């Protein structure tokens, strides 16, 4: 059979794993950070603005871990390394 | 003499003004601590040793608040009459009254009566500060707690014999002419319930309601002792003014 | 000495904002 | 703004508007802003309270026996005995700090903290 | 013999399953945690009912933002398979 | 070995993954939301009526994700894309 | 030369295993969290049991509903395998 | 080319392994959480110990049950494999 | 092709999954029960001796799931059902 | 005939996918937890932020390290695959 | 086709699962136990000395699970059961 | 096909599992320990001096596992046990 076929199937599975892990991490990390943000807003409403700077520093730094995975997933399924 | 007694009456009027000022300056803290205690009690378990009545109570610590200077007319006499009535009542209920005293006059009166005084504090009945009230309340509360483990007449694991009740006899200052010796059970406290006021937004408690209640009940005891001492000082000054008016009129 | 009327003895209380249990 | 009320047992020590109240409860350092949730806490033994005011220098208080009560539109610190920064006796506060007596050492440490020497 | 497209499609379908399962785990747990924060806040204060939804949605919008993106790429995996022969 | 067998085996594995993820997410999210609800009821009994509005919303999200996954399982197993 | 039915059955068995694994993880952890809430409520309010059963049992009902839906679909995967032939 | 039953049995073994892995994860974490609640409650109020066991062992009952169900079906996966042709 | 080889490979994969899941569950459950124990002892040292009775019960239950998996893992790899 | 390099490359891609999935899960959840602590700290005492940024970066800057270590090895798996024949 | 190569590949995947699960469990359990220890030490310095006993008990249990997993991974990889 | 190819593919997948599990455990456990550290420093700033000790005793005790996995990952991909 065609080696490219099995290589591409493996690439698809690997990219799926990448995106699944990225989604789990992003969702749970954002949920935890948002739990902190909601609790803080409940505790001190007047700190709301002050609470957004760390919140972003968390979310923006969780999303990064996600999007990098996404990028590599593309590199797995659009320009597959080792493809022949 | 007439000059001396007239000067004493004028000084007593100024001192009554000052004592009433002091009584009024302590009202806000008392109100706030009472409200805080109400909240904590509402959000806690009402099983503190101070709140629970001992079974088979057999020793009550009575704190009698008298004066130091003896120019008051019947202030000390009325206080000690109320204390003796309270002793009779305690004997009726099968309780042995252990005795604490504030002021030298009651010390002398009880010494003449051959009644042992566990402890006494003197030298501040004219202008008591919160430090004195804190010391007195600390001693009384320590005795009451030591009374928890006592059985029969044995100190128990404490090593010290305590009391099962705390009473305060002191002159409540109703007005410039009415000063009434009253007995007041300070511990154990009678937990009484009142209708719904408030609780829509629950108070947050740091760390938790029970620790705050334990830390705050002794403070409430000391605050009430301080209020009693302030009222006693005001009553003493009022009675001294009346006694000096009587003396100067007689002289 | 005539003992206190048990009602005449003021009792210190902790007010609780709940219905009676 | 929020209404701070520092109330001692003997007398009401201070009252007025504030924009921020920083203290240290038994749980830990706590900052209170105008709409903070209702709270009842016990100040630490050597607690210090900083009240940041609008257009005035922040008011630093050394507290002895504190109880914090945050409510809607008011923050009450019920103290057994408080002392403002100016009234602190730096030499006495240093002397009684590290004293054998627990309460005296706590009071001295609170005064040092209020002075900023901490 | 076996069709290479068969292997391609099986791999793509397993990968899409992985993507969607990870997205589901992330979305469910993140929504649960944010809702826990919201419910606790409401329990402590009723007036907070008004404002707690602002951060809450910001959390949820983030959480779901991942989920649906997965649900997008998963579709890309399954209906237009990259590298399909 | 017809390609349909391989494709359908992959479809079954993928649907199993989808349901496993959905079940994990739904179970843990519902558990966390219900923990919040139970703690709220314990703290403030009278709050029960007020506390179901946010709780439902939380569940309404969590379950929704699960059900979406369920839907796609069908698409994987009953009408398999890419089937020969 | 491979028997198609055998490959289909192996895939179905793996899929059902995944379904049950996810269902068990969700059920166990969700029930643990709900029970944690219940136990804490009882600890801080001894009489609360009657009041606290209703929310606890609502939570457990949702969790076990997810678990048993997964159980039913695994039964479909393993016994009445789709695409079986 | 080989015995199809071999492929079916390998798939069944992997499926049962997944079943038990998920069951173990759920049981372990759920029991840990319930026990955390119980230990904290007993730390608060030691006299409450005997009481706290009543809800705790309900929670555990709902957790381990799921686990043991996974033990059942896993056995049905391995010892008596459905579709074992 | 040797079918027994396929059976043994599948059994090894299944045992790996069983023991990995058991390890995750045991480790996290032990950590959680620990956390509870350490926090309780931190709150009241006098409660130390009275916390081991529940803790070891909890640690009793957690491992109950772990070692059973191990017990079954040994069944997979060493005496593979349907090894034929 | 199956090209051995094709099998090696497929295995390498799956291994790298696992590497990045694990790294992403760990990084996302660890950053979320550290940020939760930081946000709670700010909410409690809003003027501690400058202080908290020291431990926070010690945590996150450490968690990210693990992730990025994985980033390296995944590359080593897919771009220069060990064992390629 | 060599049966032993299939057995070796299956054993390697199984051992990877063993050690991955062990690492997840060990890391998370150690993190949780250390969280409890750090919190306790933070909120009262005096407890530092007496708060290492339960912490080390918990760490011992967690590491015991991890090293059992490591030993069984070594068993799978170096001496694969059922290898031909 | 070359048996060594199958062995190497299995080894790569196994090592990928090694790293995935190690990274998950390290990230989450280190995040939890850091949560404790940040909370402790926020509540009691002075504790910053006395908190790094247990924190390290946690972080290392986590990183250890991670790095241990790392070693074995290399062992699978550079000197594969059972390689023919």
PDB file of C-alpha atoms in Angstrom, chain B:
ATOM      1  CA  UNK B   1     -16.785  72.092 107.890  1.00  0.00           C
ATOM      2  CA  UNK B   2     -19.571  73.816 105.982  1.00  0.00           C
ATOM      3  CA  UNK B   3     -16.911  75.119 103.600  1.00  0.00           C
ATOM      4  CA  UNK B   4     -15.368  71.667 103.182  1.00  0.00           C
ATOM      5  CA  UNK B   5     -18.704  69.963 102.568  1.00  0.00           C
ATOM      6  CA  UNK B   6     -19.798  72.663 100.120  1.00  0.00           C
ATOM      7  CA  UNK B   7     -16.549  72.229  98.202  1.00  0.00           C
ATOM      8  CA  UNK B   8     -17.106  68.474  98.240  1.00  0.00           C
ATOM      9  CA  UNK B   9     -20.609  68.906  96.841  1.00  0.00           C
ATOM     10  CA  UNK B  10     -19.409  71.135  94.005  1.00  0.00           C
ATOM     11  CA  UNK B  11     -16.571  68.725  93.222  1.00  0.00           C
ATOM     12  CA  UNK B  12     -19.101  65.892  93.261  1.00  0.00           C
ATOM     13  CA  UNK B  13     -21.294  67.732  90.762  1.00  0.00           C
ATOM     14  CA  UNK B  14     -18.337  68.150  88.413  1.00  0.00           C
ATOM     15  CA  UNK B  15     -17.439  64.488  88.921  1.00  0.00           C
ATOM     16  CA  UNK B  16     -21.011  63.419  88.147  1.00  0.00           C
ATOM     17  CA  UNK B  17     -20.784  65.343  84.891  1.00  0.00           C
ATOM     18  CA  UNK B  18     -17.515  63.590  84.060  1.00  0.00           C
ATOM     19  CA  UNK B  19     -18.833  60.147  85.016  1.00  0.00           C
ATOM     20  CA  UNK B  20     -21.944  60.579  82.882  1.00  0.00           C
ATOM     21  CA  UNK B  21     -19.698  61.649  80.017  1.00  0.00           C
ATOM     22  CA  UNK B  22     -17.659  58.473  80.451  1.00  0.00           C
ATOM     23  CA  UNK B  23     -20.795  56.329  80.630  1.00  0.00           C
ATOM     24  CA  UNK B  24     -21.967  57.857  77.355  1.00  0.00           C
ATOM     25  CA  UNK B  25     -18.592  57.480  75.636  1.00  0.00           C
ATOM     26  CA  UNK B  26     -18.657  53.697  76.159  1.00  0.00           C
ATOM     27  CA  UNK B  27     -22.142  53.181  74.701  1.00  0.00           C
ATOM     28  CA  UNK B  28     -21.164  52.857  71.001  1.00  0.00           C
ATOM     29  CA  UNK B  29     -18.635  50.088  71.611  1.00  0.00           C
ATOM     30  CA  UNK B  30     -21.116  48.208  73.783  1.00  0.00           C
ATOM     31  CA  UNK B  31     -23.790  48.466  71.095  1.00  0.00           C
ATOM     32  CA  UNK B  32     -21.433  47.309  68.352  1.00  0.00           C
ATOM     33  CA  UNK B  33     -20.005  44.378  70.304  1.00  0.00           C
ATOM     34  CA  UNK B  34     -23.507  43.302  71.314  1.00  0.00           C
ATOM     35  CA  UNK B  35     -24.602  43.369  67.673  1.00  0.00           C
ATOM     36  CA  UNK B  36     -21.513  41.423  66.603  1.00  0.00           C
ATOM     37  CA  UNK B  37     -22.185  38.842  69.308  1.00  0.00           C
ATOM     38  CA  UNK B  38     -25.792  38.546  68.143  1.00  0.00           C
ATOM     39  CA  UNK B  39     -24.626  37.889  64.583  1.00  0.00           C
ATOM     40  CA  UNK B  40     -21.997  35.343  65.600  1.00  0.00           C
ATOM     41  CA  UNK B  41     -24.470  33.554  67.869  1.00  0.00           C
ATOM     42  CA  UNK B  42     -27.009  33.422  65.061  1.00  0.00           C
ATOM     43  CA  UNK B  43     -24.342  31.837  62.852  1.00  0.00           C
ATOM     44  CA  UNK B  44     -22.866  29.452  65.434  1.00  0.00           C
ATOM     45  CA  UNK B  45     -23.570  26.623  67.862  1.00  0.00           C
ATOM     46  CA  UNK B  46     -24.783  27.860  71.255  1.00  0.00           C
ATOM     47  CA  UNK B  47     -22.769  25.426  73.374  1.00  0.00           C
ATOM     48  CA  UNK B  48     -20.008  27.673  74.717  1.00  0.00           C
ATOM     49  CA  UNK B  49     -19.236  26.863  78.370  1.00  0.00           C
ATOM     50  CA  UNK B  50     -20.333  30.380  79.309  1.00  0.00           C
ATOM     51  CA  UNK B  51     -23.721  29.787  77.681  1.00  0.00           C
ATOM     52  CA  UNK B  52     -24.489  26.349  79.134  1.00  0.00           C
ATOM     53  CA  UNK B  53     -25.852  26.150  82.677  1.00  0.00           C
ATOM     54  CA  UNK B  54     -23.895  23.727  84.841  1.00  0.00           C
ATOM     55  CA  UNK B  55     -25.856  20.828  86.285  1.00  0.00           C
ATOM     56  CA  UNK B  56     -25.962  20.745  90.077  1.00  0.00           C
ATOM     57  CA  UNK B  57     -24.536  24.271  90.458  1.00  0.00           C
ATOM     58  CA  UNK B  58     -22.961  24.680  93.874  1.00  0.00           C
ATOM     59  CA  UNK B  59     -20.744  27.794  93.823  1.00  0.00           C
ATOM     60  CA  UNK B  60     -21.550  31.299  92.592  1.00  0.00           C
ATOM     61  CA  UNK B  61     -18.952  34.039  92.352  1.00  0.00           C
ATOM     62  CA  UNK B  62     -20.463  37.344  93.452  1.00  0.00           C
ATOM     63  CA  UNK B  63     -18.573  40.524  92.568  1.00  0.00           C
ATOM     64  CA  UNK B  64     -19.643  43.370  94.861  1.00  0.00           C
ATOM     65  CA  UNK B  65     -18.819  46.847  93.543  1.00  0.00           C
ATOM     66  CA  UNK B  66     -18.398  49.445  96.289  1.00  0.00           C
ATOM     67  CA  UNK B  67     -16.420  52.678  96.551  1.00  0.00           C
ATOM     68  CA  UNK B  68     -13.075  53.723  98.015  1.00  0.00           C
ATOM     69  CA  UNK B  69     -13.881  57.086  99.608  1.00  0.00           C
ATOM     70  CA  UNK B  70     -16.531  56.868 102.293  1.00  0.00           C
ATOM     71  CA  UNK B  71     -18.264  60.236 102.008  1.00  0.00           C
ATOM     72  CA  UNK B  72     -21.094  58.678  99.999  1.00  0.00           C
ATOM     73  CA  UNK B  73     -24.216  58.544 102.113  1.00  0.00           C
ATOM     74  CA  UNK B  74     -25.747  55.077 101.774  1.00  0.00           C
ATOM     75  CA  UNK B  75     -24.141  53.986  98.490  1.00  0.00           C
ATOM     76  CA  UNK B  76     -21.970  51.299 100.072  1.00  0.00           C
ATOM     77  CA  UNK B  77     -24.679  50.359 102.564  1.00  0.00           C
ATOM     78  CA  UNK B  78     -27.268  49.779  99.838  1.00  0.00           C
ATOM     79  CA  UNK B  79     -24.790  47.837  97.707  1.00  0.00           C
ATOM     80  CA  UNK B  80     -23.932  45.576 100.629  1.00  0.00           C
ATOM     81  CA  UNK B  81     -27.591  45.106 101.554  1.00  0.00           C
ATOM     82  CA  UNK B  82     -28.278  43.922  98.012  1.00  0.00           C
ATOM     83  CA  UNK B  83     -25.228  41.657  98.198  1.00  0.00           C
ATOM     84  CA  UNK B  84     -26.501  40.122 101.442  1.00  0.00           C
ATOM     85  CA  UNK B  85     -29.942  39.576  99.925  1.00  0.00           C
ATOM     86  CA  UNK B  86     -28.273  37.868  96.969  1.00  0.00           C
ATOM     87  CA  UNK B  87     -26.287  35.698  99.372  1.00  0.00           C
ATOM     88  CA  UNK B  88     -29.531  34.657 101.048  1.00  0.00           C
ATOM     89  CA  UNK B  89     -31.072  33.828  97.672  1.00  0.00           C
ATOM     90  CA  UNK B  90     -28.017  31.792  96.671  1.00  0.00           C
ATOM     91  CA  UNK B  91     -28.167  29.892  99.961  1.00  0.00           C
ATOM     92  CA  UNK B  92     -31.836  29.156  99.275  1.00  0.00           C
ATOM     93  CA  UNK B  93     -30.813  27.605  95.943  1.00  0.00           C
ATOM     94  CA  UNK B  94     -28.113  25.575  97.702  1.00  0.00           C
ATOM     95  CA  UNK B  95     -25.164  27.579  96.361  1.00  0.00           C
ATOM     96  CA  UNK B  96     -22.038  28.617  98.252  1.00  0.00           C
ATOM     97  CA  UNK B  97     -21.257  32.246  97.306  1.00  0.00           C
ATOM     98  CA  UNK B  98     -17.574  32.890  96.788  1.00  0.00           C
ATOM     99  CA  UNK B  99     -16.851  36.586  96.981  1.00  0.00           C
ATOM    100  CA  UNK B 100     -14.925  39.125  94.920  1.00  0.00           C
ATOM    101  CA  UNK B 101     -14.870  42.796  95.832  1.00  0.00           C
ATOM    102  CA  UNK B 102     -14.159  46.134  94.186  1.00  0.00           C
ATOM    103  CA  UNK B 103     -13.416  49.054  96.466  1.00  0.00           C
ATOM    104  CA  UNK B 104     -12.126  49.258 100.020  1.00  0.00           C
ATOM    105  CA  UNK B 105     -15.456  49.918 101.750  1.00  0.00           C
ATOM    106  CA  UNK B 106     -16.875  46.503 100.899  1.00  0.00           C
ATOM    107  CA  UNK B 107     -13.526  44.990 101.874  1.00  0.00           C
ATOM    108  CA  UNK B 108     -13.848  46.443 105.356  1.00  0.00           C
ATOM    109  CA  UNK B 109     -17.502  45.474 105.632  1.00  0.00           C
ATOM    110  CA  UNK B 110     -16.822  41.848 104.726  1.00  0.00           C
ATOM    111  CA  UNK B 111     -13.721  41.692 106.915  1.00  0.00           C
ATOM    112  CA  UNK B 112     -15.856  42.733 109.877  1.00  0.00           C
ATOM    113  CA  UNK B 113     -18.356  40.015 108.921  1.00  0.00           C
ATOM    114  CA  UNK B 114     -15.634  37.327 108.842  1.00  0.00           C
ATOM    115  CA  UNK B 115     -16.567  36.486 105.245  1.00  0.00           C
ATOM    116  CA  UNK B 116     -13.590  35.382 103.175  1.00  0.00           C
ATOM    117  CA  UNK B 117     -12.902  37.437 100.044  1.00  0.00           C
ATOM    118  CA  UNK B 118     -11.298  35.480  97.214  1.00  0.00           C
ATOM    119  CA  UNK B 119      -9.896  38.605  95.568  1.00  0.00           C
ATOM    120  CA  UNK B 120     -10.284  42.361  95.758  1.00  0.00           C
ATOM    121  CA  UNK B 121      -9.441  45.329  93.556  1.00  0.00           C
ATOM    122  CA  UNK B 122      -9.188  48.859  94.920  1.00  0.00           C
ATOM    123  CA  UNK B 123      -8.091  52.345  93.980  1.00  0.00           C
ATOM    124  CA  UNK B 124     -10.119  52.964  90.822  1.00  0.00           C
ATOM    125  CA  UNK B 125     -13.787  53.070  91.850  1.00  0.00           C
ATOM    126  CA  UNK B 126     -13.794  56.837  91.283  1.00  0.00           C
ATOM    127  CA  UNK B 127     -12.639  56.549  87.649  1.00  0.00           C
ATOM    128  CA  UNK B 128     -12.406  52.936  86.490  1.00  0.00           C
ATOM    129  CA  UNK B 129     -10.629  52.262  83.215  1.00  0.00           C
ATOM    130  CA  UNK B 130     -11.122  49.370  80.838  1.00  0.00           C
ATOM    131  CA  UNK B 131      -7.902  47.749  82.055  1.00  0.00           C
ATOM    132  CA  UNK B 132      -9.425  47.245  85.501  1.00  0.00           C
ATOM    133  CA  UNK B 133     -12.621  45.824  84.016  1.00  0.00           C
ATOM    134  CA  UNK B 134     -10.579  43.503  81.813  1.00  0.00           C
ATOM    135  CA  UNK B 135      -8.575  42.233  84.780  1.00  0.00           C
ATOM    136  CA  UNK B 136     -11.709  41.667  86.869  1.00  0.00           C
ATOM    137  CA  UNK B 137     -13.559  39.924  84.043  1.00  0.00           C
ATOM    138  CA  UNK B 138     -10.499  37.803  83.288  1.00  0.00           C
ATOM    139  CA  UNK B 139     -10.342  36.606  86.887  1.00  0.00           C
ATOM    140  CA  UNK B 140     -14.083  35.942  87.061  1.00  0.00           C
ATOM    141  CA  UNK B 141     -14.181  34.076  83.745  1.00  0.00           C
ATOM    142  CA  UNK B 142     -11.146  32.008  84.704  1.00  0.00           C
ATOM    143  CA  UNK B 143     -12.893  31.023  87.931  1.00  0.00           C
ATOM    144  CA  UNK B 144     -16.079  30.143  86.056  1.00  0.00           C
ATOM    145  CA  UNK B 145     -14.185  27.996  83.553  1.00  0.00           C
ATOM    146  CA  UNK B 146     -12.308  26.291  86.384  1.00  0.00           C
ATOM    147  CA  UNK B 147     -15.740  25.471  87.770  1.00  0.00           C
ATOM    148  CA  UNK B 148     -16.494  23.304  84.735  1.00  0.00           C
ATOM    149  CA  UNK B 149     -14.488  20.239  85.787  1.00  0.00           C
ATOM    150  CA  UNK B 150     -15.119  20.547  89.527  1.00  0.00           C
ATOM    151  CA  UNK B 151     -17.177  17.789  91.143  1.00  0.00           C
ATOM    152  CA  UNK B 152     -18.401  17.501  94.702  1.00  0.00           C
ATOM    153  CA  UNK B 153     -15.864  19.808  96.323  1.00  0.00           C
ATOM    154  CA  UNK B 154     -12.876  18.572  94.291  1.00  0.00           C
ATOM    155  CA  UNK B 155     -11.138  20.821  91.776  1.00  0.00           C
ATOM    156  CA  UNK B 156     -10.923  17.954  89.308  1.00  0.00           C
ATOM    157  CA  UNK B 157      -8.351  17.960  86.534  1.00  0.00           C
ATOM    158  CA  UNK B 158      -8.129  21.753  86.822  1.00  0.00           C
ATOM    159  CA  UNK B 159      -6.227  21.682  90.090  1.00  0.00           C
ATOM    160  CA  UNK B 160      -8.206  24.801  91.053  1.00  0.00           C
ATOM    161  CA  UNK B 161     -11.730  25.150  92.443  1.00  0.00           C
ATOM    162  CA  UNK B 162     -14.055  27.339  90.395  1.00  0.00           C
ATOM    163  CA  UNK B 163     -17.628  28.597  90.291  1.00  0.00           C
ATOM    164  CA  UNK B 164     -20.824  27.645  88.479  1.00  0.00           C
ATOM    165  CA  UNK B 165     -22.313  31.154  88.234  1.00  0.00           C
ATOM    166  CA  UNK B 166     -21.186  34.769  88.133  1.00  0.00           C
ATOM    167  CA  UNK B 167     -23.132  37.658  89.641  1.00  0.00           C
ATOM    168  CA  UNK B 168     -22.392  41.370  89.887  1.00  0.00           C
ATOM    169  CA  UNK B 169     -23.924  43.592  92.562  1.00  0.00           C
ATOM    170  CA  UNK B 170     -23.521  47.272  91.746  1.00  0.00           C
ATOM    171  CA  UNK B 171     -25.341  50.597  91.868  1.00  0.00           C
ATOM    172  CA  UNK B 172     -27.173  51.285  88.617  1.00  0.00           C
ATOM    173  CA  UNK B 173     -27.399  55.021  87.918  1.00  0.00           C
ATOM    174  CA  UNK B 174     -30.977  55.588  86.801  1.00  0.00           C
ATOM    175  CA  UNK B 175     -30.903  59.374  87.196  1.00  0.00           C
ATOM    176  CA  UNK B 176     -29.554  62.213  89.314  1.00  0.00           C
ATOM    177  CA  UNK B 177     -31.837  61.176  92.195  1.00  0.00           C
ATOM    178  CA  UNK B 178     -32.410  57.443  91.591  1.00  0.00           C
ATOM    179  CA  UNK B 179     -29.455  55.102  92.112  1.00  0.00           C
ATOM    180  CA  UNK B 180     -30.463  51.506  92.776  1.00  0.00           C
ATOM    181  CA  UNK B 181     -28.284  48.630  93.908  1.00  0.00           C
ATOM    182  CA  UNK B 182     -28.943  45.733  91.535  1.00  0.00           C
ATOM    183  CA  UNK B 183     -27.746  42.161  91.211  1.00  0.00           C
ATOM    184  CA  UNK B 184     -27.117  40.893  87.693  1.00  0.00           C
ATOM    185  CA  UNK B 185     -26.146  37.380  86.636  1.00  0.00           C
ATOM    186  CA  UNK B 186     -23.291  37.888  84.184  1.00  0.00           C
ATOM    187  CA  UNK B 187     -22.623  34.199  83.514  1.00  0.00           C
ATOM    188  CA  UNK B 188     -23.893  31.832  82.333  1.00  0.00           C
ATOM    189  CA  UNK B 189     -25.707  33.964  79.772  1.00  0.00           C
ATOM    190  CA  UNK B 190     -29.383  33.308  79.088  1.00  0.00           C
ATOM    191  CA  UNK B 191     -29.613  32.633  75.355  1.00  0.00           C
ATOM    192  CA  UNK B 192     -32.914  34.184  74.270  1.00  0.00           C
ATOM    193  CA  UNK B 193     -34.323  34.262  70.750  1.00  0.00           C
ATOM    194  CA  UNK B 194     -35.882  37.193  68.907  1.00  0.00           C
ATOM    195  CA  UNK B 195     -37.868  37.387  65.702  1.00  0.00           C
ATOM    196  CA  UNK B 196     -36.394  37.627  62.239  1.00  0.00           C
ATOM    197  CA  UNK B 197     -34.898  41.059  61.624  1.00  0.00           C
ATOM    198  CA  UNK B 198     -30.751  41.107  57.930  1.00  0.00           C
ATOM    199  CA  UNK B 199     -29.872  37.486  57.158  1.00  0.00           C
ATOM    200  CA  UNK B 200     -30.588  37.936  53.439  1.00  0.00           C
ATOM    201  CA  UNK B 201     -26.858  38.567  52.917  1.00  0.00           C
ATOM    202  CA  UNK B 202     -24.965  36.274  55.260  1.00  0.00           C
ATOM    203  CA  UNK B 203     -21.972  37.680  57.087  1.00  0.00           C
ATOM    204  CA  UNK B 204     -18.637  36.171  56.124  1.00  0.00           C
ATOM    205  CA  UNK B 205     -16.698  34.943  59.156  1.00  0.00           C
ATOM    206  CA  UNK B 206     -12.898  34.815  59.318  1.00  0.00           C
ATOM    207  CA  UNK B 207     -11.863  32.119  60.141  1.00  0.00           C
ATOM    208  CA  UNK B 208     -15.220  30.665  61.209  1.00  0.00           C
ATOM    209  CA  UNK B 209     -18.088  31.608  63.537  1.00  0.00           C
ATOM    210  CA  UNK B 210     -17.107  29.326  66.420  1.00  0.00           C
ATOM    211  CA  UNK B 211     -13.604  30.736  66.864  1.00  0.00           C
ATOM    212  CA  UNK B 212     -14.922  34.300  66.742  1.00  0.00           C
ATOM    213  CA  UNK B 213     -17.646  33.480  69.266  1.00  0.00           C
ATOM    214  CA  UNK B 214     -15.113  31.919  71.624  1.00  0.00           C
ATOM    215  CA  UNK B 215     -12.863  34.966  71.288  1.00  0.00           C
ATOM    216  CA  UNK B 216     -15.739  37.445  71.660  1.00  0.00           C
ATOM    217  CA  UNK B 217     -17.765  36.106  74.598  1.00  0.00           C
ATOM    218  CA  UNK B 218     -15.072  36.991  77.181  1.00  0.00           C
ATOM    219  CA  UNK B 219     -14.842  40.414  75.556  1.00  0.00           C
ATOM    220  CA  UNK B 220     -18.584  40.849  76.027  1.00  0.00           C
ATOM    221  CA  UNK B 221     -18.199  39.850  79.677  1.00  0.00           C
ATOM    222  CA  UNK B 222     -15.454  42.430  80.152  1.00  0.00           C
ATOM    223  CA  UNK B 223     -17.500  45.089  78.360  1.00  0.00           C
ATOM    224  CA  UNK B 224     -20.466  44.478  80.653  1.00  0.00           C
ATOM    225  CA  UNK B 225     -18.204  44.563  83.711  1.00  0.00           C
ATOM    226  CA  UNK B 226     -16.780  47.864  82.478  1.00  0.00           C
ATOM    227  CA  UNK B 227     -20.279  49.264  82.015  1.00  0.00           C
ATOM    228  CA  UNK B 228     -21.156  48.173  85.546  1.00  0.00           C
ATOM    229  CA  UNK B 229     -18.030  49.863  86.905  1.00  0.00           C
ATOM    230  CA  UNK B 230     -18.814  53.102  85.073  1.00  0.00           C
ATOM    231  CA  UNK B 231     -22.384  53.112  86.365  1.00  0.00           C
ATOM    232  CA  UNK B 232     -21.079  52.401  89.860  1.00  0.00           C
ATOM    233  CA  UNK B 233     -18.729  55.379  89.635  1.00  0.00           C
ATOM    234  CA  UNK B 234     -21.525  57.660  88.440  1.00  0.00           C
ATOM    235  CA  UNK B 235     -23.813  56.452  91.233  1.00  0.00           C
ATOM    236  CA  UNK B 236     -21.058  56.943  93.794  1.00  0.00           C
ATOM    237  CA  UNK B 237     -20.506  60.524  92.678  1.00  0.00           C
ATOM    238  CA  UNK B 238     -24.246  61.250  92.691  1.00  0.00           C
ATOM    239  CA  UNK B 239     -24.674  59.823  96.180  1.00  0.00           C
ATOM    240  CA  UNK B 240     -21.629  61.744  97.393  1.00  0.00           C
ATOM    241  CA  UNK B 241     -23.126  64.963  96.048  1.00  0.00           C
ATOM    242  CA  UNK B 242     -26.374  64.236  97.872  1.00  0.00           C
ATOM    243  CA  UNK B 243     -24.556  63.315 101.085  1.00  0.00           C
ATOM    244  CA  UNK B 244     -22.449  66.476 100.995  1.00  0.00           C
ATOM    245  CA  UNK B 245     -25.554  68.575 100.360  1.00  0.00           C
ATOM    246  CA  UNK B 246     -27.141  66.968 103.409  1.00  0.00           C
ATOM    247  CA  UNK B 247     -23.998  67.513 105.484  1.00  0.00           C
ATOM    248  CA  UNK B 248     -23.559  71.161 104.500  1.00  0.00           C
ATOM    249  CA  UNK B 249     -27.238  71.829 105.197  1.00  0.00           C
ATOM    250  CA  UNK B 250     -26.862  70.137 108.582  1.00  0.00           C
ATOM    251  CA  UNK B 251     -23.624  72.001 109.321  1.00  0.00           C
TER     252      UNK B 251
END
